[PDB]
Design a protein around this ligand. Sequence first.
Ligand SMILES: *[C@@H]1O[C@H](CO)[C@@H](O[C@@H]2O[C@H](CO)[C@@H](O[C@@H]3O[C@H](CO[C@H]4O[C@H](CO)[C@@H](O)[C@H](O)[C@@H]4O[C@@H]4O[C@H](CO)[C@@H](O[C@@H]5O[C@H](CO)[C@H](O)[C@H](O)[C@H]5O)[C@H](O)[C@H]4NC(C)=O)[C@@H](O)[C@H](O[C@H]4O[C@H](CO)[C@@H](O)[C@H](O)[C@@H]4O)[C@@H]3O)[C@H](O)[C@H]2NC(C)=O)[C@H](O)[C@H]1NC(C)=O
Length: 208
Amino acid sequence: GPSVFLFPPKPKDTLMISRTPEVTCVVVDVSHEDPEVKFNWYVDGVEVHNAKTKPREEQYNSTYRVVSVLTVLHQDWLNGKEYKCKVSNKALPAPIEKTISKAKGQPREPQVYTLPPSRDELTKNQVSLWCLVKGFYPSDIAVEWESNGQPENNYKTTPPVLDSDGSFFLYSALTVDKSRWQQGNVFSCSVMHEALHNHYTQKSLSLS
Ligand SMILES: *[C@@H]1O[C@H](CO)[C@@H](O[C@@H]2O[C@H](CO)[C@@H](O[C@@H]3O[C@H](CO[C@H]4O[C@H](CO)[C@@H](O)[C@H](O)[C@@H]4O[C@@H]4O[C@H](CO)[C@@H](O[C@@H]5O[C@H](CO)[C@H](O)[C@H](O)[C@H]5O)[C@H](O)[C@H]4NC(C)=O)[C@@H](O)[C@H](O[C@H]4O[C@H](CO)[C@@H](O)[C@H](O)[C@@H]4O)[C@@H]3O)[C@H](O)[C@H]2NC(C)=O)[C@H](O)[C@H]1NC(C)=O
């Protein structure tokens, strides 16, 4: 018969105001004979009616994949609300219920350190600026760079690495033309994580 899977939002989506985090309820092994799926959604056991029904997608094995997507509020996900997908389809004797919520664990605030470009990096016409982020739990984090109210995109960020104390660290390296740095322009590292005040912190650096 048909089988159900319930996915959380992408972790970065729950920390970024520029994203809409979604809980996604996927039904597979839906037959061509009985292809209609009914979804009910509950947030902490209270029904809601704003889910999006997606068009069913033909899979290459005599079945449909049927999906319902429920937008969640950033704060609702971060405050631990429980999202329940209830699925119905003639092939099933009774409805399938699945529930998902944010993982538990004691959260820990990242500490953010900016580092000016090295002494080797100077002889070249581009310099890299570093933003070291450490001591954070859980691993879910977003890191961006900006300057003069505008995004800076020439950066690489390591995925989070697990430390022996149970927390995570990473670095982000932004590369920029040396002239911009030598001109006294201010580059900012932005970090979004569930444990920061306002879920958002920023550190700047510029030349002395
Ligand atoms: C007929 O053919 C189809 C496809 O060809 C088959 O369909 C498959 O059925 C399987 C069940 O038998 C099922 O297996 C489970 O898979 C899950 C993992 O699924 C994810 O990863 C897979 C790749 O590894 C993908 O195939 C899936 O698409 C899925 O990817 C996730 O998709 C999310 C939903 O869209 C997506 O989240 C959203 O993404 C958007 C961005 O676009 C937003 O961010 C939004 O907010 C998100 O919510 C994610 O990006 C993505 N996530 C991840 C993590 O990949 C797996 O967990 C599960 O295993 C667990 O459960 C079993 C219990 O059965 C347990 O035993 C295991 O140990 C484990 O705990 C299953 O393996 C397949 O997923 C599914 N494939 C598809 C494409 O639907 C049929 O099975 C075929 N029929 C037959 C008879 O053969």
